Design an enzyme around this catalytic site. Sequence first.
Site, mmCIF file in Angstrom:
data_model
loop_
_atom_site.group_PDB
_atom_site.id
_atom_site.type_symbol
_atom_site.label_atom_id
_atom_site.label_comp_id
_atom_site.label_asym_id
_atom_site.label_seq_id
_atom_site.Cartn_x
_atom_site.Cartn_y
_atom_site.Cartn_z
ATOM 1 N N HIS A 127 -8.042 13.181 4.380
ATOM 2 C CA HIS A 127 -7.393 12.575 5.548
ATOM 3 C C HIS A 127 -6.009 12.231 4.971
ATOM 4 O O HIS A 127 -5.003 12.200 5.950
ATOM 5 C CB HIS A 127 -8.102 11.638 6.321
ATOM 6 N N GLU A 172 3.131 5.221 -12.440
ATOM 7 C CA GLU A 172 3.684 4.280 -11.266
ATOM 8 C C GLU A 172 3.435 3.088 -11.552
ATOM 9 O O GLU A 172 2.233 2.844 -11.826
ATOM 10 C CB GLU A 172 3.746 4.756 -10.078
ATOM 11 N N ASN A 186 6.037 -0.349 -10.019
ATOM 12 C CA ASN A 186 6.622 -0.451 -8.817
ATOM 13 C C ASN A 186 6.900 0.855 -8.185
ATOM 14 O O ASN A 186 7.736 1.488 -8.751
ATOM 15 C CB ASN A 186 7.837 -1.343 -9.435
ATOM 16 N N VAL A 237 11.120 1.207 -7.821
ATOM 17 C CA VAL A 237 12.091 1.022 -8.996
ATOM 18 C C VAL A 237 11.459 2.184 -9.979
ATOM 19 O O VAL A 237 10.356 2.232 -10.339
ATOM 20 C CB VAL A 237 11.881 -0.566 -9.498
ATOM 21 N N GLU A 279 7.311 7.032 -15.524
ATOM 22 C CA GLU A 279 6.819 7.960 -14.567
ATOM 23 C C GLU A 279 6.972 9.391 -14.862
ATOM 24 O O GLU A 279 7.942 9.854 -15.589
ATOM 25 C CB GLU A 279 7.751 7.550 -13.155
ATOM 26 N N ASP A 301 -14.481 13.537 2.914
ATOM 27 C CA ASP A 301 -13.290 13.474 2.860
ATOM 28 C C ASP A 301 -12.696 13.325 1.429
ATOM 29 O O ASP A 301 -12.523 12.125 0.824
ATOM 30 C CB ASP A 301 -12.979 11.899 3.514
ATOM 31 N N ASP A 322 -10.852 -6.220 0.235
ATOM 32 C CA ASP A 322 -10.816 -4.645 0.815
ATOM 33 C C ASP A 322 -10.001 -3.933 0.508
ATOM 34 O O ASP A 322 -8.807 -4.475 -0.019
ATOM 35 C CB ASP A 322 -11.151 -4.816 2.460
ATOM 36 N N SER A 323 -10.082 -2.704 0.351
ATOM 37 C CA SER A 323 -9.045 -1.813 0.365
ATOM 38 C C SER A 323 -8.495 -1.663 2.100
ATOM 39 O O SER A 323 -8.855 -2.407 2.940
ATOM 40 C CB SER A 323 -9.510 -0.438 -0.062
ATOM 41 N N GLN A 326 -4.918 0.430 4.707
ATOM 42 C CA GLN A 326 -4.086 1.282 4.989
ATOM 43 C C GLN A 326 -3.137 1.587 3.770
ATOM 44 O O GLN A 326 -2.549 0.723 3.287
ATOM 45 C CB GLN A 326 -3.312 1.157 6.343
ATOM 46 N N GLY A 327 -3.097 2.806 3.380
ATOM 47 C CA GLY A 327 -1.998 3.051 2.180
ATOM 48 C C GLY A 327 -2.840 3.145 0.870
ATOM 49 O O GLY A 327 -2.127 3.788 0.084
ATOM 50 N N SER A 338 -5.487 4.705 0.883
ATOM 51 C CA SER A 338 -6.436 5.841 1.127
ATOM 52 C C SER A 338 -6.233 6.996 0.223
ATOM 53 O O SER A 338 -5.176 7.056 -0.184
ATOM 54 C CB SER A 338 -6.140 6.323 2.654
ATOM 55 N N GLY A 339 -7.474 7.680 -0.172
ATOM 56 C CA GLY A 339 -7.330 8.618 -1.408
ATOM 57 C C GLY A 339 -7.280 8.155 -2.865
ATOM 58 O O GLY A 339 -7.454 9.004 -3.652
HETATM 59 CA CA LIG Z 1 8.460 3.335 -10.441
#
Ligand SMILES: [Ca+2]
Length: 223
Positions: A40, A52, A54, A57, A62, A84, A171-172, A174-175, A177-178
């Site tokens: 999804h 990553e 932040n 920033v 990264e 899913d 909980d986890s 929105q955002g 996900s995955g």
């Molecule tokens: Ca960063």
Amino acid sequence: IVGGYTCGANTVPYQVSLNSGYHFCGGSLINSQWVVSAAHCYKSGIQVRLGEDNINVVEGNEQFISASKSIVHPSYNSNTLNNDIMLIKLKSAASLNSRVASISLPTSCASAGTQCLISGWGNTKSSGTSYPDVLKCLKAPILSDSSCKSAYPGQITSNMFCAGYLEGGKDSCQGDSGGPVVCSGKLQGIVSWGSGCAQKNKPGVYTKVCNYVSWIKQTIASN
Ligand SMILES: [Ca+2]
């Protein structure tokens, strides 16, 4: 993640952010070339961001690598979120190091009651909206199949498990996900769905990764 903690920079080195101009989902690095996320989360034009902390920033550890291919599970059903799961291939291999590292796939399914680590850059409020910049973490236990089916009657398949706290508050969301659910050092879950976030009697529902290891292995052997 609602009710979690700041992980600490690069302490979850397999966690990726999927970016389409902005962070929109998590994922898990499973080898130098491949990421596991939720079907999804599919979008065209995904850049995988590894190393990553932040997400707003550039801190110096990264790696930003375009996806070359995304592969939604052949039986994904976006109505029920059964199956899913998605694989994303990176255009070039990540350089693995102490901050960018793969997570092992499981050999056996995880046990009910196991405490797992869930992580992401998703919303941190149950009621309302606040998205963090740094990676958040949560320790949550796998719930029994029967408790998970009682919480979501007629909606839980054998490819899903619940984890979290029936009293609400953790909980986890929105955002997230995955992203990963790691239990005894293996990727056992993918943040999939739930009714709201951190609501009483509505735990998180996760894709059961141990049901997909044969698909993942034959797909990565072929692409
Ligand atoms: Ca960063």
